[PDB]
Amino acid sequence: GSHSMRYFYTAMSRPGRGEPRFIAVGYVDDTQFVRFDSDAASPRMAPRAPWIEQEGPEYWDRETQISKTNTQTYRESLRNLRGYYNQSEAGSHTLQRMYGCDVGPDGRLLRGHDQSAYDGKDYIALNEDLSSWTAADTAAQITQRKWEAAREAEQWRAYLEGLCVEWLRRYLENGKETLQRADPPKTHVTHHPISDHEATLRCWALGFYPAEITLTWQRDGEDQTQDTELVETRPAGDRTFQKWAAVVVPSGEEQRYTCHVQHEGLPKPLTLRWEP
């Protein structure tokens, strides 16, 4: 029953094709609730979940202005980072940031997060103390010095312990019917002969929310980690997620295998077998 709020910012340069595109999306747990895209015909922070639509015009104006200011500041950051790495003006580069807070069942701050990446590599992260930075390299040290000077960490601490937690609590209450509803997986085991000698047992979990799930195969009560093909958890498109785990078993040994499912929506963790 712990919960997270996160924002994900992506700025990507595209020399010869206009100014760097800035995108921002906001999530509570696995539910996206806002987006901004500088490439939109008329850029504004827009709702992506029913429970945020009740926020008034002052909400939408604040979030839009922040995004518009970010679009400009990220383009400045990208030019700066291009300089920090002695890079040509000809290449495309990406800057990403993800930040937010985690709260426990009582709604108290468990921890805050703020991390940035440049071209997919860790660049600078706010430490868990919310008061110092970890810089990945000598370029990120220049940013760290700027941010220290501007007293950024103190701003992040205030936000993370304050507005982040307060607004996550409000969103959780406003969207309680969905954000605080865990939907358990619908589970089944299918069997697909590979050859005379072997078959695939595939354990499915469908329709679950949130995405966090554990699917394991055991043979004679021993976990089959090395032998299990586990696909990435994937969105169904209706808020829910899907996952499966597969093992190749010798023919006639199917009953030695059990599929185990843990999900917070489940009254009790499930043990499943192929039922021919």
């Binding site: 500041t73 941010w147 507005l163």
Partner: peptide, 9 residues
Amino acid sequence: VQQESSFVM
């Protein structure tokens, strides 16, 4: 809600 637009890198 978002953090205020942060300082340039």
